[PDB]
Amino acid sequence: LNPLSPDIWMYVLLACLGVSCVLFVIARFSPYEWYNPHPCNPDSDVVENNF
């Protein structure tokens, strides 16, 4: 742990978590991520995001 001051570590973790929340609110609230599931899919209608 030594090379980094005992503050950034916490900054690191909090930034990780805040970024993650941003990511997920982007994905489940997005006009694109919603996806056709079937490998051979003939325009189904049970699409959804994958996050």
Add this chain to the structure above:
Amino acid sequence: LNPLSPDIWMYVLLACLGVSCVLFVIARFSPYEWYNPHPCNPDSDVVENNF
């Protein structure tokens, strides 16, 4: 950026754009840059190109 002339810092990004666009253009006029949708059915088009 300190041990780095920003001239490099911009050369890199212009190179990024150049390689990306030229790569995609190469992809379009390519024989092998076409995958088949719904591979279980061979009778369709091959518009799937992955670029």
